[PDB]
């Protein structure tokens, strides 16, 4: 159940790869524009 | 004199004369590419 | 005040590399011979390309420069050909060049690997190494369905100083004094260094004792050829080339002495 | 924009001498051999062969600049000898050494090819 | 906290700071709050058990991604304002029982300390072994390094684009490049560099290159330049049009020849174009009569070749042409090169393979740098990279140069190098290429990932 | 496929919006200027949830 | 006080131990574009004519 | 973007080793043993086959300009 | 021609140079004339102005030429001197254990412009004729100048006791009648210091003589370094296990001492010093303990260096680096200071969230207890970036104030 | 910036503080302790914009 120190180096980088496989490198730019089109514009109107 | 152009979507060799709006008669694409010239260009393998 | 009486002892000879040993000669003669193997050994290689059609993802200069690096069998033909500078012909001829041709088009859906096997030459003696009748064929460029590559190349005679494509060697392992007897090097911790393949010493020892009256002798060599010239032909063509430069230099010298 | 031709390193320019001899005035029986379109390949072998001649007091070579393809060889000999004669014998000795080395290589190649 | 960890009413982006001394409790949902993920920590153990790593390995089958990891309450998005009330653990090793308990009350843990680095700094191998400014100067050079900025470079008609002939992935790479896609679009070449003073042409942040390697495509690149032009029909007073100018009708026609142009007024691909040449023949009607020449000439000192030509219509329905010129840039004297540790310098001179040093075997160094740049800058990473690269090439793997990795030091790399018949400290005996004599000082040599910068001398 | 995106295309020029840093709003910050008639100054850049006017700094 | 000037140049620098401290390596392109207005005299009429 | 012809350092032909190198990797061979079977001993040539990125395979995914 | 580089700080930033035409497209400079311009070859660009008049040509030929601009009135000492390679090799060239054969000498003497063509009698005629480095440098030195200097490693307890005129380490440079009688040359004898062999060459001998003295020192020494050769690698940054154990023990004691100092102040057992606050006293004591450990560790490393070490060959000759760089590369980097003080509590009573609150210890306040070779930890790396970033900010801000 | 994939990613993950490059105060340009995990302490220009133009961290 517990991740041993020898297997940690493989687990941490595995978790990181999942992050970049879902969010990406420019997720902060896409999410910003997305929320702007879905909510901000409709709210401004 | 013919000035045959190429398309970006259909890759059809269509003739286009001057004073003619750019539009592919085969697919209507508005971007045209020119064909490789016939001149003899030399390339030294260095 | 005279020359040496050098000897030779070959320990390995193959179609790719040749390992020999030169004794009773000066370090300069051994080094210059090493430099000639790379920079003063004539060889045939592509030096002129005319792309008639190229729809591949690689521009012309990428292909032309790539064709030059393709080794061509030049064992007995390079000696017969002449340099374009000395030839009294036009831009090209059969005596100063070897015409090549390439015509490939990817009609199928699978990627077509344009290799050196497609380079059709007019002279059957001068052909790509991999095409010489294991080793695979050189990869020039990959083509997609609908792409085409058609050109007309010409090979010439040249040596390394003009371009690396005219280098018939793939590595020249020049070594002398495996055991550091002359102390040309100074190992701060000789025990931490490995033993050379030509070393003659017990594992308990690190380096041979100092020899004050010692001189660089017994130079080892390993001429790994690219494939164009046989490992043995490179040496013979090298010594003949180095002997020709000195012969011509001697002529120009006498031409200056008698003029003074 | 300025890449000099590659063949300019080996080909002699029209009206340019392959070798020029200039007598040195600092010391007697000395000369400077300015050879064009050469490199360390020839300077060292001639240098080494000159040192082995006991009648040669000074024998050295230098490259005024790597980008250039010329070389300067200084030769100082005894009054009874001549530097030009040393530069000639050094070449003749090197030629014989290579001829002997060439022949002895064919024999070794032949002996190895057979067995 | 329990609600945010369960993807409940409170979303993960919500920050909840409980100042204890000051009884304030500030919750934030505004935008712009920079935050990062962290592994939640129980009393003394992590919540990221082994069952998770199992599911994350089969990520392509069971569609178990980062989102399912956050919803499980294992990870938490922590912002800067909340870090003040958070007690982090650099690695799980700090959570174990020690002879003297430092904290013993951890509440969070770092996934990997290397994540504090950006994009241009993650590509640096062993950045924890170099002077900090150097890592900064590299982060500013990585953006100037040549390579393949994008796979579809043949379709994009950009005004300036530098493409490397033979890109290579770094033998000494970090485990973060796999996510930056540097392995797929590298921006440099692994070079056999030798840190030595050879003729003095590499001093004061300079390098000596191998002319033979350059002849085989070493760091060779191509320069793409796009020229755009359009014919404006603003009004009947004066109208522009693409057409082959003529010396009898056009007024502002330079002495340059216009034969390379076609009847359409645009040059054709595959044509060789030099400086002062014309690529677009444009004429404007006058109020050398009734029309003036307004052709677009090429920039001086270019000597390029037209790769392709495009013709289309802009917003105003007018003709719009783009000509992408191609020019091969060979690395020569004056071109700037830089490693991944701030070691920048220009190619002082190009020596051939015959004039360059070599080991017992025919291995000449593609580049030679002056060792004087190491002590002042203290770029030890350049030496370890040159070492791990020599082990990786001789071992058949890719060196893992993660910044903070205790499983890789200089001693282990040295022992692995002694098994392949090389000096454990990377040094190697070289032979002077001019005379063949050995070099008294055993030179340091090995593969090092170098980069070429767009700042050339021809420009 | 590797292009991460996150940028626009205006007149054929790929433009990217640079994230601009700014002092947080609706928060109290007590500073102290050395050269000023006031010893300590507590400001709060206030702005409604749905921003409609500039920041009214008090 | 400070203004642009003719007969100037600019480019990257390079080390060259084979030059004296008072010597500078000038390329052939910059030297070809830049010139020096030399007056003609019977001592240099021959050289300047061939040039 | 495609495997070079010669090694920049030595000059050994490597263009004919990429396809063979890939055919071995898929055969459960190690990067080191594979490079040894191809005759690559010097770490200079091994660098070319182990540090190369076959980008042309990605450039061929885009349709050409002419059919 | 007039060769200039911006920013033009001093009068030597625009010196007259003679033209040398060659193929390639870069401004190639001598390496000694790069110190006045403060110009490195990391992509720097330098303008070139060509005077179009004989008056201007003659004016520059007599006032702004490099030879006439060697010595500066700013500090009555030369500004241009021997440089990176020519300074490290000349050090390893003039040593006592440097012997040249008949072949190597002729190669070096061939690069001498001020050579009468007479080979000097070697310092060893049997059993094998061998020249020494000093015997060749004597030919490089012009005229019959006389100078006395001291090598960087010259001990202070040598000029008092015996062997003051016969140094065992070949220190105490002594030039007599234009001959290097003895001594190891370095920046103190050839650099930009006052009274060096160059400054004396420009005063006694003219400027043209000193010009050749510069070139000859570069060509010859560089052609000899081609044989000896120099490098730098991991073998020079590694120290024996004994040295590391002494360092770790030294640091382990410093961290223990600070813990005692912290316990004293925490128990009110620490009193402030006259003219300083309790907190200032605590920081002063801590800074002293750490600074002493850095110096102690630095000395232990310097002693562990061998005569073949290349790092030592750089600090000794002064070509590049100092004893601090070695101590940071081998033993310990040291304490990182921000605005002359330790890493401040950017967070609430913390430097980083990984440390406890109110932790004035060495690791929490930015003590880099690791070396650049052993590798820095995440916390030590972030702190090291601050000490560096502060340097970039200053270098980027003072330009305006200093330029104004 | 389309000169390399690293520049594109950095430019898309770039920050900017509107303090003004004209400012000569080192306090805002200094690497604060709070740049940990949120920003790259190394990635930053060395010209007249040190510390102002930053670059987001990987995570
Ligand atoms: Mg600079
Ligand atoms: Zn179409
Ligand atoms: Zn012919
Ligand atoms: Zn190789």
Angstrom CA distances, C216 to C44, D62, I1, stand at 35, 22, 49
Contact B33/H64, CB-based, under 8 Å?
no
Cβ atoms of J34 and I347 closer than 8 Å:
yes
Tell me if residue I202 falls in helix, strand or coil.
helix
How wide is the angle at C-alpha F25 spanned by C-alphas F24 and F27, nearest 5°? Answer: 90
Cβ atoms of E172 and E449 closer than 8 Å:
yes
Query: Beta-strand (E) ranges in I90-146?
Result: 99-100, 131-132
H helices of I33-122, in order, are 54-63, 84-93, 102-109
User: In the structure encoding, which two tokens stand for residue C179, read together?
Assistant: 């055991």
The DSSP 8-state label assigned to residue I216 in this structure reads H
* Residue E20 backbone phi and psi in degrees, to 5: -95, -55
Cβ atoms of E399 and E125 closer than 8 Å:
yes
Give the CA count within 13 Å in the CB-facing half-sphere of I330.
36
**Which sign, positive or negative, has the C-alpha torsion D45, G20, I312, E369?**
negative
Contacts of E60 (CB under 8 A, 6+ apart): none
Annotated ligand binding at B24? The verdict is yes
Tell me how far apart the alpha carbons of residues C67 and C116 are, in angstroms, rounded to a whole number. Answer: 9
Altogether, the residues listed in chain E come to a count of 459
Cβ atoms of E172 and E125 closer than 8 Å:
yes
Residue C34: Cβ-neighbour burial (10 angstroms; 0-12, 13-18, 19+): buried
User: In the structure encoding, which two tokens stand for residue I29, read together?
Assistant: 């400079």
Cβ atoms of J14 and J53 closer than 8 Å:
yes
Cβ atoms of C46 and C154 closer than 8 Å:
yes
Annotated ligand binding at H49? The verdict is no
Nearest residue of B to residue H65, measured between CA atoms: B11
Tell me how far apart the alpha carbons of residues E295 and E335 are, in angstroms, rounded to a whole number. Answer: 33
User: In the structure encoding, which two tokens stand for residue C28, read together?
Assistant: 């300069």
Residues 288-347 of E with CB under 8 A from H: 308
Residues of D in contact with I102 (CB under 8 A): 51
First to last CA, chain D: 56
The DSSP 8-state label assigned to residue E235 in this structure reads B
Give Cα E4 distance to the centre of its chain.
38
Tell me how far apart the alpha carbons of residues G24 and I17 are, in angstroms, rounded to a whole number. Answer: 6
First to last CA, chain H: 23
Tell me how far apart the alpha carbons of residues E106 and E124 are, in angstroms, rounded to a whole number. Answer: 31
* Residue E76 backbone phi and psi in degrees, to 5: -145, 135
Tell me how far apart the alpha carbons of residues E357 and E435 are, in angstroms, rounded to a whole number. Answer: 10
Nearest residue of I to residue J21, measured between CA atoms: I397
Tell me how far apart the alpha carbons of residues E149 and E323 are, in angstroms, rounded to a whole number. Answer: 20
Contacts of E10 (CB under 8 A, 6+ apart): E3, E4, E16
Exactly one of E205, E293, E335, E366 is catalytic; which is it?
E205
User: In the structure encoding, which two tokens stand for residue C258, read together?
Assistant: 């008698």
Listed residue (C104, C116, C103) closest to C143, CA to CA:
C104
* Residue E306 backbone phi and psi in degrees, to 5: -75, 120
Angstrom CA distances, C66 to B29, C135, D7, E151, H5, stand at 36, 19, 20, 21, 7
Residue J59: Cβ-neighbour burial (10 angstroms; 0-12, 13-18, 19+): buried
**Which sign, positive or negative, has the C-alpha torsion D26, D27, D29, D33?**
negative
Tell me how far apart the alpha carbons of residues E66 and E79 are, in angstroms, rounded to a whole number. Answer: 18
Contact E438/C57, CB-based, under 8 Å?
no
Q: Distance, CA E205 to ligand 1 centroid (Å)?
A: 9
Tell me how far apart the alpha carbons of residues H33 and H40 are, in angstroms, rounded to a whole number. Answer: 10
Give Cα E267 distance to the centre of its chain.
34
Cβ atoms of E267 and E273 closer than 8 Å:
yes
Contacts of C67 (CB under 8 A, 6+ apart): B45, C46, C49, C119, C140, C153
Cβ atoms of E113 and J52 closer than 8 Å:
no
Task: Tell how strand C154-158 and strand C43-54 pair up.
Answer: antiparallel
The answer regarding whether domain I84-226 maps to CATH 1.10.274.100 reads: yes
User: In the structure encoding, which two tokens stand for residue B6, read together?
Assistant: 């190429």
The DSSP 8-state label assigned to residue E115 in this structure reads G
Tell me how far apart the alpha carbons of residues E149 and E142 are, in angstroms, rounded to a whole number. Answer: 12
Q: Which helix (H) or strand (E) holds H23?
A: helix H18-25
Active site residue E205: yes
Give Cα E275 distance to the centre of its chain.
31
Q: Distance, CA B40 to ligand 3 centroid (Å)?
A: 21
Q: Is J20 on the interface with E (CB under 8 A)?
A: no
H helices of chain D, in order, are 40-51, 83-114
Cβ atoms of B42 and C45 closer than 8 Å:
no
**Which sign, positive or negative, has the C-alpha torsion E302, E306, E311, E315?**
negative
Residue H26: Cβ-neighbour burial (10 angstroms; 0-12, 13-18, 19+): exposed
Tell me how far apart the alpha carbons of residues I248 and I196 are, in angstroms, rounded to a whole number. Answer: 41
**Which sign, positive or negative, has the C-alpha torsion J12, J17, J18, J20?**
negative
Cβ atoms of E190 and E171 closer than 8 Å:
yes
User: In the structure encoding, which two tokens stand for residue H11, read together?
Assistant: 């000059």
Q: Which residue shows structure tokens 């030592």?
A: I312
Q: Is D44 on the interface with E (CB under 8 A)?
A: yes
Tell me if residue A27 falls in helix, strand or coil.
helix
Residues of D in contact with E301 (CB under 8 A): 1
Q: Distance, CA J45 to ligand 1 centroid (Å)?
A: 16
> Residue-wise over C35-50: b if at least 16 C-beta within 10 A, else e?
bbbbbbbbbbbbbbbe
Resolution in A: 3.6
Q: Distance, CA I40 to ligand 1 centroid (Å)?
A: 5
Considering only the C-alpha atoms of chain I, give the largest distance between any 2 of them, rounded to a whole number of Å.
Answer: 83
Listed residue (I47, I392, I365) closest to J44, CA to CA:
I392
User: In the structure encoding, which two tokens stand for residue I292, read together?
Assistant: 């002493």
Angstrom CA distances, H56 to C58, E148, E169, E185, stand at 9, 11, 15, 11
* Residue C191 backbone phi and psi in degrees, to 5: -70, -25
Contact D65/G18, CB-based, under 8 Å?
yes
How wide is the angle at C-alpha E429 spanned by C-alphas E425 and E432, nearest 5°? Answer: 145
Residue I52: how many other CB atoms lie within 10 Å: 14
In the structure, how many helices (H) and strands (E) does chain A have?
3, 0
Nearest residue of C to residue D11, measured between CA atoms: C85
Q: Which residue shows structure tokens 């930056």?
A: E180
Tell me how far apart the alpha carbons of residues E143 and D48 are, in angstroms, rounded to a whole number. Answer: 51
First to last CA, chain B: 36
User: In the structure encoding, which two tokens stand for residue A36, read together?
Assistant: 């702007």
Tell me how far apart the alpha carbons of residues C159 and C166 are, in angstroms, rounded to a whole number. Answer: 5
User: In the structure encoding, which two tokens stand for residue E386, read together?
Assistant: 């040159």
Q: Is the peptide bond before E71 cis (omega within 30 degrees of 0)?
A: no
Tell me how far apart the alpha carbons of residues H60 and A12 are, in angstroms, rounded to a whole number. Answer: 35
Contacts of I326 (CB under 8 A, 6+ apart): E375, I298, I301, I302, I305, I311, I312, I315
Contact G28/D1, CB-based, under 8 Å?
no
User: In the structure encoding, which two tokens stand for residue D2, read together?
Assistant: 């300025």
Cβ atoms of C157 and C48 closer than 8 Å:
no
Give the CA count within 13 Å in the CB-facing half-sphere of E9.
0
In order, the DSSP letters of chain C are ------EE--SEE-SSEEEEEEES--HHHHHHHHHHHHHS--EEEEEEEEEEEE-SSS-HHHHHHHHHTS-B--TTTTTTS--TTT--SSS--TTT-EEEEEEEE--SSSPEEEEGGG-EESSSSS-BTTT-------EEEEE-TT-EEEE--EEEEE-TTT-GGG--EEEE--B--SS-SS-SS--SSGGGS---TT----TT-SSPPP-TT-----EEEEEEE-SSS-HHHHHHHHHHHHHHHHHHHHHHHHHHHTT-
The DSSP 8-state label assigned to residue A40 in this structure reads I
Tell me if residue E296 falls in helix, strand or coil.
strand
How wide is the angle at C-alpha H44 spanned by C-alphas H43 and H50, nearest 5°? Answer: 75
Contacts of I14 (CB under 8 A, 6+ apart): I2, I3, I4, I8, I64
Q: Is G22 on the interface with I (CB under 8 A)?
A: yes
User: In the structure encoding, which two tokens stand for residue G44, read together?
Assistant: 């240099």
What are the sequence ranges of the domains in chain C?
Answer: 1-42+165-260, 43-164
Candidate from E30, E32, E184 with C-beta closest to F2: E184
Contact J32/I353, CB-based, under 8 Å?
no
Q: Is the peptide bond before I116 cis (omega within 30 degrees of 0)?
A: no
Cβ atoms of I182 and I173 closer than 8 Å:
yes
Tell me how far apart the alpha carbons of residues E259 and D33 are, in angstroms, rounded to a whole number. Answer: 52
Mutate to test the interface with A, among J12, J15, J40 (most CBs of A within 10 A): J12
Residues of E in contact with J4 (CB under 8 A): 142-149, 185, 187
Cβ atoms of I123 and I133 closer than 8 Å:
no
Contacts of C227 (CB under 8 A, 6+ apart): C16, C71, C73, C129, C130, C132, H13
Q: Distance, CA H9 to ligand 4 centroid (Å)?
A: 5
Tell me how far apart the alpha carbons of residues E123 and J4 are, in angstroms, rounded to a whole number. Answer: 13
Listed residue (E274, E278, E308) closest to E294, CA to CA:
E278
User: In the structure encoding, which two tokens stand for residue I241, read together?
Assistant: 């296990």
**Which sign, positive or negative, has the C-alpha torsion E400, E404, E406, E410?**
positive
């Amino acid at each position: 159940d517990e991740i041993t120190p020898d297997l940690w180096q493989e687990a941490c980088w595995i978790v990181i790869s999942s992050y970049f496989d879902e969010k990406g490198l420019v997720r902060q730019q896409l999410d910003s524009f997305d929320e702007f089109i879905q909510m901000s514009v409709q709210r401004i109107v | 004199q013919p000035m045959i152009y190429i398309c970006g979507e259909c890759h059809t060799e269509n003739e286009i004369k001057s004073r003619d709006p750019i539009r592919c008669r085969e697919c209507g694409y508005r971007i045209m590419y020119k064909k490789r010239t016939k001149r003899l260009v030399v390339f030294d393998a260095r | 005040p005279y020359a040496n009486q050098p000897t030779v002892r070959i320990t390995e000879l193959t179609d790719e590399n040749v390992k020999f040993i030169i004794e009773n000669t000066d370090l300069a003669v051994a080094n210059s011979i090493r430099r000639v193997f790379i920079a003063e050994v004539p060889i045939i290689a592509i030096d002129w390309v005319q792309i008639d059609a190229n729809s591949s993802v690689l521009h012309d200069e990428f292909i032309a420069h790539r064709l030059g690096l393709i080794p061509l069998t030049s064992d007995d033909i390079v000696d017969k050909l002449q340099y374009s500078r000395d030839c009294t012909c036009e831009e090209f001829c059969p005596e100063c060049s070897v015409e090549f041709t390439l015509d490939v088009r990817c009609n199928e859906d699978q990627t077509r690997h344009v290799t050196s096997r497609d380079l059709i030459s007019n002279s059957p003696r001068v052909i790509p190494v991999t095409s010489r009748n294991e080793q695979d064929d050189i990869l020039i460029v990959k083509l997609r369905k609908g792409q085409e590559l058609r050109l007309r190349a010409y090979a010439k005679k040249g040596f390394g100083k003009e371009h690396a494509k005219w280098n018939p060697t793939a590595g020249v392992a020049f070594e002398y004094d495996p055991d550091n007897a002359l102390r040309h090097t100074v190992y701060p911790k000789p025990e931490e260094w490995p033993k050379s393949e030509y070393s003659e010493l017990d594992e308990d020892e690190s380096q041979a004792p100092y020899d004050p009256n010692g001189k660089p002798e017994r130079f080892y060599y390993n001429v790994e050829s690219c494939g164009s010239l046989r490992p043995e032909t490179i040496v013979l063509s090298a010594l003949s080339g180095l002997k020709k430069k000195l012969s011509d230099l001697q002529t120009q010298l006498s031409h200056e002495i008698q003029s003074d | 924009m300025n890449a000099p031709p590659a063949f300019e390193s080996f080909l002699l320019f029209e009206g340019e001498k392959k070798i020029t001899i200039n007598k040195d005035t600092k010391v007697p029986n000395a000369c400077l051999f300015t050879i064009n379109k050469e490199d360390h390949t020839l300077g060292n072998i001639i240098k080494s062969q000159l040192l082995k001649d006991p009648q040669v007091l000074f024998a050295g070579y230098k490259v005024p600049h790597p980008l250039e393809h010329k070389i300067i060889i200084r030769v100082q000999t005894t009054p009874d000898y001549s530097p030009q004669e040393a530069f000639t014998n050094a070449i003749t000795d090197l030629i014989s050494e290579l001829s002997l080395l060439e022949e002895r290589f064919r024999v070794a190649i032949k002996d190895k090819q057979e067995g | 906290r329990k609600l945010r960890r369960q993807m409940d009413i409170i979303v993960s982006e919500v920050s909840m700071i409980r100042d204890i001394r000051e009884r304030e409790i500030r919750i934030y949902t505004d935008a712009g709050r920079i935050c990062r993920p962290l592994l939640i920590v129980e009393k003394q153990k992590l919540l990221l058990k082994k069952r998770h790593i199992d599911q994350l390995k089969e990520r392509e089958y069971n569609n178990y991604s980062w989102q399912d990891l956050v919803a499980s309450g294992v990870v938490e998005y922590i912002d800067t304002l909340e870090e003040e009330t958070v007690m982090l653990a650099m690695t799980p090793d700090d959570l174990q029982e020690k002879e003297v308990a430092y904290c013993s009350t951890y509440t969070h843990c770092e996934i990997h300390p290397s994540m504090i680095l950006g994009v241009c700094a993650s590509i640096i191998p062993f950045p924890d072994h170099n002077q900090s400014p150097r890592n900064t100067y590299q982060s500013a050079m990585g953006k100037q390094a040549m390579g393949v900025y994008i796979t579809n470079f043949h379709v994009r008609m950009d005004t300036l684009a530098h493409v490397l002939y033979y890109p290579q992935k770094p033998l000494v790479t970090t485990r973060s490049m796999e996510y930056l896609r540097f392995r797929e679009l590298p921006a440099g070449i692994n070079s056999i560099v030798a840190i030595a003073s050879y003729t003095g042409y590499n001093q004061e942040d300079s390098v000596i290159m191998n002319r033979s390697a350059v002849d085989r495509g070493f760091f060779r690149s191509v320069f793409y330049r796009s020229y755009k032009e359009q014919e404006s029909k603003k009004g009947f007073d004066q109208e522009e049009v693409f057409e082959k100018p003529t010396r009898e009708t056009c007024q502002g026609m330079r002495h340059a020849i216009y034969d390379k142009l076609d009847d359409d007024g645009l040059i054709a691909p595959g044509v060789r174009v030099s400086g002062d040449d014309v690529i677009i023949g444009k004429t404007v009607t006058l109020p050398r009569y009734t029309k003036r020449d307004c052709s677009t000439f090429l920039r001086t000192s270019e000597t390029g070749i037209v790769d392709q030509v495009m013709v289309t219509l802009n917003q105003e329905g007018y003709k719009f042409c783009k000509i992408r010129v191609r020019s091969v840039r060979i690395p020569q004297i004056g071109d700037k090169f830089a490693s991944r540790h701030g070691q920048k310098g220009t190619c002082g001179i190009q020596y051939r393979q015959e004039d360059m040093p070599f080991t017992c075997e025919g291995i000449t160094p593609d580049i030679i740098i002056n060792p004087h740049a190491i002590p002042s800058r203290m770029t030890i990473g350049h030496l370890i990279e040159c070492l791990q690269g020599k082990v990786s090439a001789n071992k058949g793997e890719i060196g893992d140069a993660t910044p903070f990795n205790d499983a890789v030091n200089v001693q282990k790399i040295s022992n692995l190098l002694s098994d392949y018949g090389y000096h454990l400290r990377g040094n190697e005996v070289l032979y002077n290429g001019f005379t063949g004599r050995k070099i008294t000082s055993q030179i340091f040599i090995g593969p090092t990932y170098y980069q070429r910068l767009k700042h050339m001398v021809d420009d | 496929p590797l292009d991460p995106g996150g940028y626009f295309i205006i007149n054929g020029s790929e433009k990217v919006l640079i994230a601009q840093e700014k002092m947080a709003t609706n928060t109290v910050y007590v500073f102290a200027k050395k050269d000023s008639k006031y010893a300590y100054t507590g400001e709060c850049r206030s702005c409604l949830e749905n921003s409609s006017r500039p920041t009214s700094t008090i | 006080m400070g203004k642009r000037v003719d007969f100037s140049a600019r480019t990257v620098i390079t080390p060259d131990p084979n030059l004296s401290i008072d010597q500078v390596g000038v390329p052939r392109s910059i030297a070809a574009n830049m010139t020096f207005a030399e007056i003609v005299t019977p001592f240099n009429i021959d050289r300047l004519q061939e040039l | 973007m495609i495997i070079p012809v010669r090694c920049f350092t030595c000059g050994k032909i490597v263009g004919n080793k990429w396809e063979a190198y890939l055919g071995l990797l898929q055969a459960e061979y190690t990067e080191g043993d594979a490079l040894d079977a191809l005759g690559l001993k010097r770490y200079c040539c091994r660098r070319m086959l182990l540090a190369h990125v076959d980008l042309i395979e990605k450039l061929l995914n885009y349709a050409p300009l002419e059919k | 021609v007039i060769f200039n580089r911006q920013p033009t700080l001093h009068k030597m930033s625009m010196m007259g140079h003679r033209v040398r035409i060659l193929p390639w497209s870069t401004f190639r400079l001598n390496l000694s004339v790069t110190t006045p311009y403060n110009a490195d070859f990391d992509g720097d660009e330098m303008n070139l102005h060509l005077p179009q008049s004989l008056e201007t040509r003659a004016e520059i030929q007599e006032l702004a030429m490099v030879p006439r601009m060697i010595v500066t009135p700013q500090s009555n000492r030369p500004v241009m001197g021997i440089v990176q390679d020519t300074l490290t090799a000349v050090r390893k060239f003039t040593k006592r254990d440097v012997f040249l054969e008949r072949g190597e000498v002729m190669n070096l003497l061939m690069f001498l412009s001020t050579w009468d063509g007479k080979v000097p009698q070697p310092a060893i005629l049997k059993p094998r004729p061998l020249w020494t480095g000093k015997q060749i440098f004597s030919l490089i030195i012009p005229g019959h100048i006389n100078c006395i200097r001291t090598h960087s490693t010259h001990p202070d307890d040598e000029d008092s006791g015996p062997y003051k005129h016969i140094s065992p380490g070949d220190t105490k440079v002594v030039v007599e009648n234009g001959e290097l009688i003895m001594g190891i040359l370095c920046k103190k004898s050839l650099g930009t210091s006052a009274g060096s062999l160059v400054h004396i060459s420009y005063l006694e001998m003219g400027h043209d003589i000193t010009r050749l003295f510069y070139s000859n020192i570069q060509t010859v020494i560089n052609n000899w370094l081609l044989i000896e050769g120099h490098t730098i690698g991991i073998g020079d940054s590694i120290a024996d296990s004994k040295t590391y154990q002494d360092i770790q023990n030294t640091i382990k004691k410093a961290k223990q001492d600070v813990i005692e100092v912290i316990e004293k102040a925490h128990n009110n057992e620490l009193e402030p010093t006259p003219g300083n606050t309790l907190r200032q006293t605590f920081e002063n004591q801590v800074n002293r303990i750490l600074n002493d450990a850095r110096d102690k560790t630095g000395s232990s490393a310097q002693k562990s260096l061998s005569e073949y070490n290349n790092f030592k060959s750089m600090v000794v000759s002064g070509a590049k680096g100092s004893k601090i760089n070695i101590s940071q590369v081998i033993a310990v980097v040291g304490q990182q200071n921000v605005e002359g003080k330790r890493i401040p509590f950017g967070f609430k009573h913390r430097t980083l969230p990984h440390f406890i609150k109110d932790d004035y210890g060495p690791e929490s306040r930015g003590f880099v207890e690791n070396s650049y070779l052993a590798g820095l930890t995440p916390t030590e790396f972030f702190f090291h970036a601050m000490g560096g970033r502060e340097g970039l900010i200053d270098t980027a801000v003072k330009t305006a104030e200093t330029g104004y | 910036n389309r000169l390399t994939f690293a520049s594109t990613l950095s430019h898309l993950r770039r920050l900017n503080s509107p303090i003004g490059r004209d400012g000569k105060l080192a306090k805002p340009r200094q690497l604060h302790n709070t740049l940990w995990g949120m920003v790259c302490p190394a990635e930053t220009p060395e010209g007249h914009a040190v510390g102002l133009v930053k670059n987001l961290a990987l995570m």
